[PDB]
Amino acid sequence: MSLFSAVELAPRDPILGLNEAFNADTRPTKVNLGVGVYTNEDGKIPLLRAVRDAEKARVEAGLPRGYLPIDGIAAYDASVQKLLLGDDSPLIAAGRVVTAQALGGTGALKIGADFLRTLNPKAKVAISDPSWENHRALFDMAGFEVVAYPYYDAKTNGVNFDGMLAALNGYEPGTIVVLHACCHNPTGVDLNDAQWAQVVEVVKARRLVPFLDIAYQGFGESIEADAAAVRLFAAANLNVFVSSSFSKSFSLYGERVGALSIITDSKDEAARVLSQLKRVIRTNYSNPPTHGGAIVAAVLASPELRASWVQELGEMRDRIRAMRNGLVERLKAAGIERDFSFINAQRGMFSYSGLTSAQVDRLREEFGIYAVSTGRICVAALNTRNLDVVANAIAAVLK
Amino acid sequence: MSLFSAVELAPRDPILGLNEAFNADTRPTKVNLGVGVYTNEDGKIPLLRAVRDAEKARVEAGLPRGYLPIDGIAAYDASVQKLLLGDDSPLIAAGRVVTAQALGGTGALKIGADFLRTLNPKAKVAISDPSWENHRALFDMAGFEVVAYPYYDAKTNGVNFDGMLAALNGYEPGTIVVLHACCHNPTGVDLNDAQWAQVVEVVKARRLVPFLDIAYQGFGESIEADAAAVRLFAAANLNVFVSSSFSKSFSLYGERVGALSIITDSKDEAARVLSQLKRVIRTNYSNPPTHGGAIVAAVLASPELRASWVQELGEMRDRIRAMRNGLVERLKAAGIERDFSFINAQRGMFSYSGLTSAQVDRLREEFGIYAVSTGRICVAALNTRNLDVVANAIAAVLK
């Protein structure tokens, strides 16, 4: 009968079990492919040059640290909109886009979810099959029933687009559809620009609410190309929600730098929407933190710093591609039955390897190489120092 | 039929209107007593020497920015507990205290509220009459009905403590009672230590859930004394929620550094409670920002920095005291018959001046002194350069 006596232990994230086993493994050569960050060859997170440079310049200014506005640093908010929509967006010019700084991509999703709940608390939320675990968890906690649209096709290592479109073609008006812009998490399987056009047409025709989640702008093809899906929705004169993150693109995970952007029909509608979004932020955490956002805003505003960022993010994009192709080449040379060509078609930090749970267990026990029970691997955790070890271990497990 | 067509324009924050008026006043002797932050003799928000040093050390170290644990930097959480409960707390030793890094005091209130809603969604929340405006808004948005206990007594400039106790004695088991630990915001009227003892007794007897809000530890009497209310609840073996903030005490408003602490009955219960708190954090913003928390942790861990902080916090405490007494002295010298003793009895950044709305209007129009319509003034906005203009204006409006 005490206040907490009925409190249960929360469900364990299945990652915790993987990390526990990895950590207890006394072999000095072990590889964790279950992570969700981009690492360097020492298994550590890089500090980007543009970030280091910006921080060094800013700390010398010794600035006071009063509160930011509820919706964050205005210049940051403006730079985010241009990064997403393009410098010459007519929506920006018409004052139709609302952007609030947020606590990463996660925070943006939350503030969007909470605002959406006030608009129509009977709407359902549709996510990809499968999706980044916190999509379902976040929207369910925000009060929504969550359903999944067909997406990943294990038989083809691609997208079951027919199943996706058929699902969308059955959703009721107001259903919130959570769409990865690119670099699908956790599978790496992405839609092409033509499949995106069909998605936009159905969302429009059925009055669905698209909620784009763009956490990897720059990891797919290019900074500009990776925004394509967001811009297609923008061009369609839809109300669109966009959660964006700089956690990965700036290697700034732990500073919690993202944004929620909403496309509205008018300046007046933008003002009303922002006014309500401010309430939802203020009663959660008042106003956002300064450091991360200030640094991203500084990098984006400086031609030199921005060019350094573009270059480095491109090197990260390209290293992932080199690892993807190196794994494919090696598994081919190894004489494996399974064709791993799909690894080059998948994009971003992850791939669904297609290893069975049994094969993943063998890979761990026999070789100290840790993949997720789903077959997920973080290709961003491969480097020239472990690539051959990993490829040879896979070749061994696959017979 | 459009998605946002029913969205209303939220009511605008009245303080913005006051600030904009203040900024549109051309009189260079104007003073804004409607603010909510500490400023120094020079009228600036201070960057504390200890923070300057910790920040410089952090940035120049060139450190990467991986994700923090969901519950933040463990060393920071540990330092918070000892700051609140004392180094030799037997509850800390027994593993009974849960502490999660939070997005300021506000964020701590939010995570606590969301957790409480899962425990018992029918509980009501009782706040002081009056209270920091975001108390009512935050708990309402989190799904609670909010009531107010009698507290500030306009006729005595003190506390209606009989009314307060009568209210608590009428509340049902499970009622969450939000209690300012010291430096009451917005009145500056605090409970004495005999009063606190009775509040603990009633909370215990009536099975109420105390939620302490300690945003000004160090601004009342001392760092240790200011935690007395918290320690009294801890000593009574009650399950107590504590939102603590470093926004004011470290002058780190814009970095969002605070914490939620919860006293539980056992190490096992602490594990189950923490796990649930993690779930509430993860589905909100995933994990907290690093920069401000790293700075606080460093200050508290570095003897030389901690000592600098103690000194400088004491100087802020002492400057407010100097402003309160300097105001009282000048009003007496100006020949005001009213007893302003209460300005010296009241503690922290705010006082209710007792001016009527119409007297506040005249202070603005005639003298360019901007007070809130409630008569609230920020005594930390006074300094030696504006004390006479403020005292002379107040005297003019009071015969």
mmCIF file of all heavy atoms in Angstrom, chain A residues 7-8 10 45 55 65-66 110 134 254-256 272 275-276 282 284-285 287 290-291, chain B residues 4 7-8 10 55 65 110 133-134 254-256 272 275-276 282 284-285 287 290-291:
data_model
loop_
_atom_site.group_PDB
_atom_site.id
_atom_site.type_symbol
_atom_site.label_atom_id
_atom_site.label_comp_id
_atom_site.label_asym_id
_atom_site.label_seq_id
_atom_site.Cartn_x
_atom_site.Cartn_y
_atom_site.Cartn_z
ATOM 1 N N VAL A 7 4.888 -0.448 -8.246
ATOM 2 C CA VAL A 7 5.640 -0.080 -9.437
ATOM 3 C C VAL A 7 6.445 -1.289 -9.934
ATOM 4 O O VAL A 7 7.219 -1.882 -9.179
ATOM 5 C CB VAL A 7 6.569 1.151 -9.150
ATOM 6 C CG1 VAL A 7 7.507 1.445 -10.312
ATOM 7 C CG2 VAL A 7 5.730 2.385 -8.789
ATOM 8 N N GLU A 8 6.255 -1.619 -11.210
ATOM 9 C CA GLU A 8 6.987 -2.718 -11.858
ATOM 10 C C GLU A 8 8.329 -2.240 -12.388
ATOM 11 O O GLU A 8 8.521 -1.069 -12.627
ATOM 12 C CB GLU A 8 6.209 -3.220 -13.086
ATOM 13 C CG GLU A 8 5.045 -4.140 -12.812
ATOM 14 C CD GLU A 8 4.379 -4.583 -14.118
ATOM 15 O OE1 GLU A 8 5.110 -4.800 -15.081
ATOM 16 O OE2 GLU A 8 3.131 -4.684 -14.184
ATOM 17 N N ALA A 10 10.440 -1.612 -15.451
ATOM 18 C CA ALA A 10 10.067 -1.334 -16.833
ATOM 19 C C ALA A 10 10.614 -2.428 -17.784
ATOM 20 O O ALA A 10 11.627 -3.056 -17.511
ATOM 21 C CB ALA A 10 10.592 0.043 -17.272
ATOM 22 N N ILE A 45 33.556 8.040 -30.943
ATOM 23 C CA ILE A 45 32.801 9.044 -31.727
ATOM 24 C C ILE A 45 33.664 10.240 -32.104
ATOM 25 O O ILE A 45 34.337 10.826 -31.252
ATOM 26 C CB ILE A 45 31.590 9.483 -30.913
ATOM 27 C CG1 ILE A 45 30.630 8.311 -30.811
ATOM 28 C CG2 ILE A 45 30.899 10.710 -31.526
ATOM 29 C CD1 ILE A 45 29.703 8.412 -29.666
ATOM 30 N N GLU A 55 33.301 25.842 -31.432
ATOM 31 C CA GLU A 55 33.269 25.876 -29.953
ATOM 32 C C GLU A 55 34.430 26.712 -29.441
ATOM 33 O O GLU A 55 34.279 27.437 -28.462
ATOM 34 C CB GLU A 55 33.337 24.499 -29.313
ATOM 35 C CG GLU A 55 32.115 23.647 -29.554
ATOM 36 C CD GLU A 55 32.164 22.353 -28.766
ATOM 37 O OE1 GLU A 55 33.054 21.517 -29.004
ATOM 38 O OE2 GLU A 55 31.320 22.178 -27.859
ATOM 39 N N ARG A 65 24.319 33.462 -20.075
ATOM 40 C CA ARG A 65 23.547 32.276 -20.431
ATOM 41 C C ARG A 65 22.152 32.356 -19.804
ATOM 42 O O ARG A 65 21.754 31.391 -19.093
ATOM 43 C CB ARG A 65 24.305 30.995 -20.009
ATOM 44 C CG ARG A 65 24.355 29.938 -21.112
ATOM 45 C CD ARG A 65 25.179 30.407 -22.345
ATOM 46 N NE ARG A 65 26.534 30.877 -21.977
ATOM 47 C CZ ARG A 65 27.609 30.088 -21.805
ATOM 48 N NH1 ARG A 65 27.569 28.755 -22.002
ATOM 49 N NH2 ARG A 65 28.768 30.648 -21.465
ATOM 50 N N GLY A 66 21.471 33.492 -20.079
ATOM 51 C CA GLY A 66 20.009 33.638 -19.882
ATOM 52 C C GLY A 66 19.180 32.694 -20.741
ATOM 53 O O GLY A 66 19.737 31.895 -21.486
ATOM 54 N N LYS A 110 8.272 14.462 -30.086
ATOM 55 C CA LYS A 110 7.448 14.574 -28.880
ATOM 56 C C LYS A 110 6.578 15.827 -28.929
ATOM 57 O O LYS A 110 5.395 15.792 -28.687
ATOM 58 C CB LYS A 110 8.354 14.615 -27.646
ATOM 59 C CG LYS A 110 7.671 14.829 -26.307
ATOM 60 C CD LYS A 110 6.593 13.799 -26.050
ATOM 61 C CE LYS A 110 6.076 13.868 -24.632
ATOM 62 N NZ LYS A 110 4.751 13.218 -24.415
ATOM 63 N N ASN A 134 11.829 3.765 -30.809
ATOM 64 C CA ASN A 134 11.236 4.828 -30.045
ATOM 65 C C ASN A 134 10.098 5.491 -30.808
ATOM 66 O O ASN A 134 9.327 6.228 -30.196
ATOM 67 C CB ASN A 134 12.312 5.822 -29.573
ATOM 68 C CG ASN A 134 11.919 6.587 -28.324
ATOM 69 O OD1 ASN A 134 11.118 6.094 -27.539
ATOM 70 N ND2 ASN A 134 12.428 7.833 -28.165
ATOM 71 N N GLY A 254 24.946 14.017 -27.940
ATOM 72 C CA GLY A 254 24.775 14.350 -26.524
ATOM 73 C C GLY A 254 24.475 15.810 -26.205
ATOM 74 O O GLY A 254 24.293 16.131 -25.038
ATOM 75 N N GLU A 255 24.404 16.691 -27.208
ATOM 76 C CA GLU A 255 23.949 18.093 -27.004
ATOM 77 C C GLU A 255 22.454 18.307 -27.341
ATOM 78 O O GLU A 255 21.902 19.367 -27.021
ATOM 79 C CB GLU A 255 24.819 19.097 -27.765
ATOM 80 C CG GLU A 255 26.295 19.053 -27.392
ATOM 81 C CD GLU A 255 26.647 19.491 -25.978
ATOM 82 O OE1 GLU A 255 25.749 19.566 -25.072
ATOM 83 O OE2 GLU A 255 27.876 19.660 -25.763
ATOM 84 N N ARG A 256 21.809 17.303 -27.956
ATOM 85 C CA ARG A 256 20.345 17.239 -28.124
ATOM 86 C C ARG A 256 19.860 18.409 -29.011
ATOM 87 O O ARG A 256 19.140 19.295 -28.555
ATOM 88 C CB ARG A 256 19.590 17.254 -26.800
ATOM 89 C CG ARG A 256 20.173 16.338 -25.701
ATOM 90 C CD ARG A 256 20.321 14.894 -26.126
ATOM 91 N NE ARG A 256 19.089 14.319 -26.618
ATOM 92 C CZ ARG A 256 18.879 13.812 -27.838
ATOM 93 N NH1 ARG A 256 19.816 13.790 -28.791
ATOM 94 N NH2 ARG A 256 17.665 13.335 -28.127
ATOM 95 N N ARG A 272 -0.872 31.066 -35.325
ATOM 96 C CA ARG A 272 -1.688 30.275 -34.406
ATOM 97 C C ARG A 272 -0.989 28.955 -33.986
ATOM 98 O O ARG A 272 -0.955 28.574 -32.781
ATOM 99 C CB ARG A 272 -3.093 30.018 -35.028
ATOM 100 C CG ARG A 272 -3.884 31.321 -35.160
ATOM 101 C CD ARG A 272 -5.299 31.121 -35.674
ATOM 102 N NE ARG A 272 -5.388 30.895 -37.110
ATOM 103 C CZ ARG A 272 -5.679 29.742 -37.735
ATOM 104 N NH1 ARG A 272 -5.876 28.589 -37.101
ATOM 105 N NH2 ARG A 272 -5.736 29.735 -39.057
ATOM 106 N N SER A 275 1.870 29.473 -31.662
ATOM 107 C CA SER A 275 1.436 29.889 -30.366
ATOM 108 C C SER A 275 1.045 28.696 -29.502
ATOM 109 O O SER A 275 1.236 28.693 -28.273
ATOM 110 C CB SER A 275 0.286 30.932 -30.446
ATOM 111 O OG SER A 275 -0.999 30.363 -30.708
ATOM 112 N N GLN A 276 0.501 27.682 -30.139
ATOM 113 C CA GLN A 276 0.112 26.468 -29.439
ATOM 114 C C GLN A 276 1.311 25.563 -29.213
ATOM 115 O O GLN A 276 1.426 24.921 -28.168
ATOM 116 C CB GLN A 276 -1.009 25.732 -30.200
ATOM 117 C CG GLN A 276 -2.321 26.513 -30.237
ATOM 118 C CD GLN A 276 -2.858 26.927 -28.872
ATOM 119 O OE1 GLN A 276 -2.674 26.221 -27.865
ATOM 120 N NE2 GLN A 276 -3.540 28.066 -28.831
ATOM 121 N N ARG A 282 6.560 24.814 -23.386
ATOM 122 C CA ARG A 282 6.808 25.519 -22.151
ATOM 123 C C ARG A 282 6.443 24.634 -20.969
ATOM 124 O O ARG A 282 7.116 24.716 -19.950
ATOM 125 C CB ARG A 282 6.007 26.849 -22.077
ATOM 126 C CG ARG A 282 6.173 27.536 -20.750
ATOM 127 C CD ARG A 282 6.167 29.063 -20.798
ATOM 128 N NE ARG A 282 5.858 29.580 -19.458
ATOM 129 C CZ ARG A 282 6.669 29.562 -18.396
ATOM 130 N NH1 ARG A 282 7.917 29.074 -18.455
ATOM 131 N NH2 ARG A 282 6.223 30.064 -17.241
ATOM 132 N N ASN A 284 6.702 21.497 -20.782
ATOM 133 C CA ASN A 284 7.521 20.294 -20.805
ATOM 134 C C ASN A 284 8.905 20.693 -20.231
ATOM 135 O O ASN A 284 9.307 20.227 -19.141
ATOM 136 C CB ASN A 284 7.579 19.771 -22.240
ATOM 137 C CG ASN A 284 8.432 18.515 -22.395
ATOM 138 O OD1 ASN A 284 9.230 18.176 -21.508
ATOM 139 N ND2 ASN A 284 8.243 17.786 -23.515
ATOM 140 N N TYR A 285 9.615 21.605 -20.909
ATOM 141 C CA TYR A 285 10.990 21.928 -20.435
ATOM 142 C C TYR A 285 11.330 23.438 -20.503
ATOM 143 O O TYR A 285 12.494 23.816 -20.306
ATOM 144 C CB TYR A 285 12.038 21.112 -21.193
ATOM 145 C CG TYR A 285 11.935 21.267 -22.690
ATOM 146 C CD1 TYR A 285 12.496 22.347 -23.342
ATOM 147 C CD2 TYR A 285 11.191 20.382 -23.427
ATOM 148 C CE1 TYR A 285 12.306 22.507 -24.701
ATOM 149 C CE2 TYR A 285 10.982 20.543 -24.784
ATOM 150 C CZ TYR A 285 11.559 21.615 -25.420
ATOM 151 O OH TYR A 285 11.410 21.747 -26.808
ATOM 152 N N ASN A 287 12.190 25.970 -22.195
ATOM 153 C CA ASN A 287 12.913 26.486 -23.339
ATOM 154 C C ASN A 287 14.124 25.573 -23.538
ATOM 155 O O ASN A 287 14.478 24.827 -22.632
ATOM 156 C CB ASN A 287 13.304 27.966 -23.133
ATOM 157 C CG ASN A 287 13.789 28.255 -21.731
ATOM 158 O OD1 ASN A 287 14.856 27.750 -21.322
ATOM 159 N ND2 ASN A 287 12.974 29.043 -20.941
ATOM 160 N N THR A 290 21.209 25.843 -24.974
ATOM 161 C CA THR A 290 21.839 26.795 -25.867
ATOM 162 C C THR A 290 23.002 26.200 -26.649
ATOM 163 O O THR A 290 23.097 26.406 -27.869
ATOM 164 C CB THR A 290 22.342 28.044 -25.105
ATOM 165 O OG1 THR A 290 21.224 28.718 -24.526
ATOM 166 C CG2 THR A 290 22.996 29.100 -26.085
ATOM 167 N N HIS A 291 23.887 25.473 -25.966
ATOM 168 C CA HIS A 291 25.169 25.180 -26.538
ATOM 169 C C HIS A 291 25.117 24.541 -27.934
ATOM 170 O O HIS A 291 25.728 25.062 -28.896
ATOM 171 C CB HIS A 291 25.984 24.314 -25.602
ATOM 172 C CG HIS A 291 27.423 24.201 -26.044
ATOM 173 N ND1 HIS A 291 28.249 25.255 -26.016
ATOM 174 C CD2 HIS A 291 28.131 23.140 -26.600
ATOM 175 C CE1 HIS A 291 29.481 24.877 -26.494
ATOM 176 N NE2 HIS A 291 29.407 23.586 -26.862
ATOM 177 N N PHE B 4 -5.436 22.617 -39.387
ATOM 178 C CA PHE B 4 -5.155 23.626 -38.352
ATOM 179 C C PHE B 4 -6.231 24.710 -38.288
ATOM 180 O O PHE B 4 -6.078 25.731 -37.601
ATOM 181 C CB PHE B 4 -3.806 24.294 -38.580
ATOM 182 C CG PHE B 4 -2.628 23.342 -38.611
ATOM 183 C CD1 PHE B 4 -1.709 23.407 -39.648
ATOM 184 C CD2 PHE B 4 -2.484 22.374 -37.662
ATOM 185 C CE1 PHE B 4 -0.616 22.523 -39.702
ATOM 186 C CE2 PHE B 4 -1.400 21.483 -37.702
ATOM 187 C CZ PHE B 4 -0.456 21.581 -38.715
ATOM 188 N N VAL B 7 -7.284 25.757 -34.850
ATOM 189 C CA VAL B 7 -6.255 26.152 -33.914
ATOM 190 C C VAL B 7 -6.423 27.634 -33.597
ATOM 191 O O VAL B 7 -6.416 28.465 -34.500
ATOM 192 C CB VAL B 7 -4.848 25.831 -34.473
ATOM 193 C CG1 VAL B 7 -3.755 26.318 -33.536
ATOM 194 C CG2 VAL B 7 -4.687 24.326 -34.667
ATOM 195 N N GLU B 8 -6.601 27.956 -32.315
ATOM 196 C CA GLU B 8 -6.752 29.334 -31.882
ATOM 197 C C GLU B 8 -5.397 29.944 -31.585
ATOM 198 O O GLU B 8 -4.439 29.243 -31.285
ATOM 199 C CB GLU B 8 -7.587 29.398 -30.597
ATOM 200 C CG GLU B 8 -9.033 29.001 -30.769
ATOM 201 C CD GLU B 8 -9.778 28.988 -29.446
ATOM 202 O OE1 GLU B 8 -9.239 29.434 -28.403
ATOM 203 O OE2 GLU B 8 -10.914 28.509 -29.453
ATOM 204 N N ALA B 10 -3.066 31.434 -29.106
ATOM 205 C CA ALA B 10 -2.995 31.283 -27.657
ATOM 206 C C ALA B 10 -2.907 32.633 -27.020
ATOM 207 O O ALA B 10 -2.513 33.587 -27.673
ATOM 208 C CB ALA B 10 -1.794 30.468 -27.262
ATOM 209 N N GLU B 55 33.853 25.821 -18.094
ATOM 210 C CA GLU B 55 33.481 25.789 -19.506
ATOM 211 C C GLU B 55 34.713 25.842 -20.423
ATOM 212 O O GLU B 55 34.789 25.083 -21.402
ATOM 213 C CB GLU B 55 32.526 26.915 -19.833
ATOM 214 C CG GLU B 55 31.902 26.746 -21.200
ATOM 215 C CD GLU B 55 30.888 27.824 -21.489
ATOM 216 O OE1 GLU B 55 30.936 28.891 -20.806
ATOM 217 O OE2 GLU B 55 30.059 27.607 -22.389
ATOM 218 N N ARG B 65 31.006 13.799 -28.310
ATOM 219 C CA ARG B 65 29.675 14.141 -27.836
ATOM 220 C C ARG B 65 28.702 13.026 -28.102
ATOM 221 O O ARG B 65 27.641 13.218 -28.658
ATOM 222 C CB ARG B 65 29.226 15.418 -28.488
ATOM 223 C CG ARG B 65 28.864 16.507 -27.518
ATOM 224 C CD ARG B 65 29.841 16.883 -26.387
ATOM 225 N NE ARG B 65 31.089 17.448 -26.853
ATOM 226 C CZ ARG B 65 31.276 18.674 -27.385
ATOM 227 N NH1 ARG B 65 30.254 19.519 -27.495
ATOM 228 N NH2 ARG B 65 32.494 19.025 -27.847
ATOM 229 N N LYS B 110 8.203 18.176 -14.917
ATOM 230 C CA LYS B 110 7.538 17.435 -15.989
ATOM 231 C C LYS B 110 7.719 15.920 -15.896
ATOM 232 O O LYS B 110 6.760 15.146 -15.981
ATOM 233 C CB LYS B 110 8.039 17.943 -17.357
ATOM 234 C CG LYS B 110 7.553 17.131 -18.563
ATOM 235 C CD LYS B 110 6.037 17.097 -18.637
ATOM 236 C CE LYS B 110 5.488 16.690 -20.012
ATOM 237 N NZ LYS B 110 4.032 16.370 -19.981
ATOM 238 N N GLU B 133 4.007 30.713 -12.260
ATOM 239 C CA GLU B 133 2.868 30.481 -13.116
ATOM 240 C C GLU B 133 2.894 29.102 -13.771
ATOM 241 O O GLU B 133 1.861 28.527 -14.050
ATOM 242 C CB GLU B 133 2.827 31.547 -14.228
ATOM 243 C CG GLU B 133 1.671 31.388 -15.213
ATOM 244 C CD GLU B 133 1.978 30.573 -16.481
ATOM 245 O OE1 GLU B 133 3.196 30.350 -16.762
ATOM 246 O OE2 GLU B 133 0.984 30.193 -17.214
ATOM 247 N N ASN B 134 4.081 28.594 -14.050
ATOM 248 C CA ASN B 134 4.203 27.346 -14.813
ATOM 249 C C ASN B 134 3.865 26.131 -13.975
ATOM 250 O O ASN B 134 3.707 25.062 -14.547
ATOM 251 C CB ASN B 134 5.568 27.183 -15.469
ATOM 252 C CG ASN B 134 5.525 26.293 -16.738
ATOM 253 O OD1 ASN B 134 4.481 26.175 -17.390
ATOM 254 N ND2 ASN B 134 6.686 25.695 -17.111
ATOM 255 N N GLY B 254 20.118 29.112 -19.541
ATOM 256 C CA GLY B 254 19.978 28.698 -20.952
ATOM 257 C C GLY B 254 20.571 27.358 -21.339
ATOM 258 O O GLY B 254 20.498 26.975 -22.505
ATOM 259 N N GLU B 255 21.167 26.662 -20.381
ATOM 260 C CA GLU B 255 21.692 25.334 -20.615
ATOM 261 C C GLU B 255 20.806 24.204 -20.087
ATOM 262 O O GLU B 255 21.095 23.027 -20.341
ATOM 263 C CB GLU B 255 23.146 25.185 -20.108
ATOM 264 C CG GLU B 255 24.145 26.196 -20.707
ATOM 265 C CD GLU B 255 24.394 26.140 -22.237
ATOM 266 O OE1 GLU B 255 23.818 25.294 -22.985
ATOM 267 O OE2 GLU B 255 25.271 26.948 -22.676
ATOM 268 N N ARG B 256 19.746 24.552 -19.354
ATOM 269 C CA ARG B 256 18.726 23.605 -18.888
ATOM 270 C C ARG B 256 19.249 22.496 -18.007
ATOM 271 O O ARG B 256 19.239 21.300 -18.399
ATOM 272 C CB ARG B 256 17.896 23.037 -20.069
ATOM 273 C CG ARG B 256 17.567 24.072 -21.147
ATOM 274 C CD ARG B 256 16.874 25.361 -20.660
ATOM 275 N NE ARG B 256 15.624 25.038 -19.968
ATOM 276 C CZ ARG B 256 15.325 25.336 -18.687
ATOM 277 N NH1 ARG B 256 16.167 26.016 -17.917
ATOM 278 N NH2 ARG B 256 14.171 24.937 -18.174
ATOM 279 N N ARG B 272 13.226 -0.036 -9.536
ATOM 280 C CA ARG B 272 11.976 -0.100 -10.284
ATOM 281 C C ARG B 272 11.508 1.318 -10.640
ATOM 282 O O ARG B 272 11.185 1.601 -11.791
ATOM 283 C CB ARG B 272 10.908 -0.872 -9.518
ATOM 284 C CG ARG B 272 11.167 -2.372 -9.508
ATOM 285 C CD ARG B 272 10.147 -3.171 -8.736
ATOM 286 N NE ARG B 272 10.409 -3.162 -7.295
ATOM 287 C CZ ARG B 272 9.667 -2.610 -6.345
ATOM 288 N NH1 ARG B 272 8.538 -1.939 -6.595
ATOM 289 N NH2 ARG B 272 10.079 -2.714 -5.094
ATOM 290 N N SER B 275 13.673 2.821 -13.362
ATOM 291 C CA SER B 275 13.372 2.243 -14.666
ATOM 292 C C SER B 275 12.150 2.912 -15.311
ATOM 293 O O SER B 275 12.067 3.043 -16.521
ATOM 294 C CB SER B 275 13.156 0.737 -14.589
ATOM 295 O OG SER B 275 11.875 0.334 -14.078
ATOM 296 N N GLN B 276 11.171 3.245 -14.495
ATOM 297 C CA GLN B 276 9.959 3.896 -14.987
ATOM 298 C C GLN B 276 10.236 5.363 -15.328
ATOM 299 O O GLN B 276 9.753 5.871 -16.342
ATOM 300 C CB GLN B 276 8.826 3.775 -13.949
ATOM 301 C CG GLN B 276 8.343 2.346 -13.758
ATOM 302 C CD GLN B 276 7.669 1.753 -14.980
ATOM 303 O OE1 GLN B 276 7.252 2.496 -15.909
ATOM 304 N NE2 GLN B 276 7.536 0.433 -15.015
ATOM 305 N N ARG B 282 12.784 8.812 -21.936
ATOM 306 C CA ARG B 282 13.152 8.298 -23.256
ATOM 307 C C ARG B 282 12.136 8.698 -24.315
ATOM 308 O O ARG B 282 12.504 9.036 -25.440
ATOM 309 C CB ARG B 282 13.290 6.768 -23.230
ATOM 310 C CG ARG B 282 13.276 6.092 -24.580
ATOM 311 C CD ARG B 282 14.493 6.394 -25.444
ATOM 312 N NE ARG B 282 14.749 5.343 -26.464
ATOM 313 C CZ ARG B 282 15.536 5.552 -27.529
ATOM 314 N NH1 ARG B 282 16.092 6.730 -27.711
ATOM 315 N NH2 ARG B 282 15.747 4.608 -28.413
ATOM 316 N N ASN B 284 10.267 11.296 -24.344
ATOM 317 C CA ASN B 284 10.119 12.736 -24.331
ATOM 318 C C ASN B 284 11.291 13.345 -25.111
ATOM 319 O O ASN B 284 11.094 13.870 -26.208
ATOM 320 C CB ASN B 284 10.029 13.229 -22.883
ATOM 321 C CG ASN B 284 9.787 14.732 -22.782
ATOM 322 O OD1 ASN B 284 10.000 15.481 -23.750
ATOM 323 N ND2 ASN B 284 9.431 15.196 -21.569
ATOM 324 N N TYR B 285 12.523 13.174 -24.639
ATOM 325 C CA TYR B 285 13.655 13.720 -25.356
ATOM 326 C C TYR B 285 14.875 12.790 -25.399
ATOM 327 O O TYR B 285 15.974 13.253 -25.725
ATOM 328 C CB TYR B 285 14.072 15.076 -24.708
ATOM 329 C CG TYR B 285 14.311 14.933 -23.192
ATOM 330 C CD1 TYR B 285 15.543 14.562 -22.680
ATOM 331 C CD2 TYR B 285 13.294 15.136 -22.290
ATOM 332 C CE1 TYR B 285 15.773 14.430 -21.319
ATOM 333 C CE2 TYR B 285 13.512 14.993 -20.927
ATOM 334 C CZ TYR B 285 14.744 14.643 -20.448
ATOM 335 O OH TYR B 285 14.926 14.454 -19.094
ATOM 336 N N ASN B 287 17.461 11.520 -23.960
ATOM 337 C CA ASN B 287 18.504 11.681 -22.973
ATOM 338 C C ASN B 287 18.886 13.175 -22.937
ATOM 339 O O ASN B 287 18.520 13.935 -23.848
ATOM 340 C CB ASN B 287 19.675 10.721 -23.311
ATOM 341 C CG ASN B 287 20.014 10.755 -24.790
ATOM 342 O OD1 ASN B 287 20.494 11.791 -25.264
ATOM 343 N ND2 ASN B 287 19.805 9.624 -25.538
ATOM 344 N N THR B 290 24.481 17.692 -22.718
ATOM 345 C CA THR B 290 25.733 17.489 -21.976
ATOM 346 C C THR B 290 26.370 18.736 -21.375
ATOM 347 O O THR B 290 26.845 18.697 -20.248
ATOM 348 C CB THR B 290 26.765 16.815 -22.897
ATOM 349 O OG1 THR B 290 26.263 15.518 -23.311
ATOM 350 C CG2 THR B 290 28.159 16.602 -22.199
ATOM 351 N N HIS B 291 26.459 19.791 -22.154
ATOM 352 C CA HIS B 291 27.305 20.961 -21.847
ATOM 353 C C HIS B 291 27.082 21.504 -20.452
ATOM 354 O O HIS B 291 28.037 21.561 -19.659
ATOM 355 C CB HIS B 291 27.093 22.040 -22.926
ATOM 356 C CG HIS B 291 28.151 23.110 -22.934
ATOM 357 N ND1 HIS B 291 29.427 22.838 -23.197
ATOM 358 C CD2 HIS B 291 28.086 24.468 -22.653
ATOM 359 C CE1 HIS B 291 30.162 23.966 -23.125
ATOM 360 N NE2 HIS B 291 29.372 24.961 -22.766
#
